[PDB]
Amino acid sequence: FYTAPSTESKFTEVLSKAKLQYPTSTTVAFADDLLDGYAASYFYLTSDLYMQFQVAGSSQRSELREMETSGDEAAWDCTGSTAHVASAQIAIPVQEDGIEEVTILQVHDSDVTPVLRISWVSSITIDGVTSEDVVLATIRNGIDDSTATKTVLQAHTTSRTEFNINVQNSKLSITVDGTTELDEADISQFDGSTCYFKAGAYNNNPTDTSANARIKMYELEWVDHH
């Protein structure tokens, strides 16, 4: 009894340029499946026209992964001259008890490393400063370095919020409701990698493995500019 996100034309293009992974990295719906009305408890259209992602369990996900309309996986040069831009209007609900971090947007390399995660966190401590209930950017310092540089982007609100990721040359910027919150962070550690965007709900380190992470997107797109 779930309504498909494909019923809203504002999602046709991104769905044509995506596949849906749930609950792990395996694809459950390709672009053609999505466009043909795919819907489930973990991926459906709400009555006020949000595409909602929901998932339980540690490191489990309900996530769109950027594709080309040709059926090729997106695999653009992470630090190339062509700009890559993802734009989303996201409402992050108050998360269920036991949910501690939910990744909502990513730039990921074509192997095993997230270049950027934008996530909601219950708490984070950065350079001795603890912030509660915030949206965070995490940029990995390298493929062979498990550490990352973290930047608080926004105090969590349930209100619909515009996120924009702009990747061009070896730099990455993030705007939140029109304000630059990460200005040309260096991602040269991904020279020679290829990359793609992701969007959805990726449940990181929950304390209750049965609780559902839940994220809603009112608009979503990813584009190239040459």
Ligand SMILES: *[C@@]1(O[C@H]2[C@H](O)[C@H](O)[C@H](O)O[C@@H]2C(=O)O)O[C@H](C(=O)O)[C@@H](O[C@@H]2O[C@H](C(=O)O)[C@@H](O)[C@H](O)[C@@H]2O)[C@H](O)[C@@H]1O
């Ligand atoms: C890291 O995020 C990982 C996600 O949790 C998912 O597993 C994803 O699939 O891959 C991400 C990744 O590998 O980058 O998780 C580690 C971690 O939890 O161990 C983070 O490293 C720690 O970061 C904290 C901190 O900076 O707050 C440090 O105190 C700690 O010593 C580790 O360096 C890593 O930054 C990142 O979030």
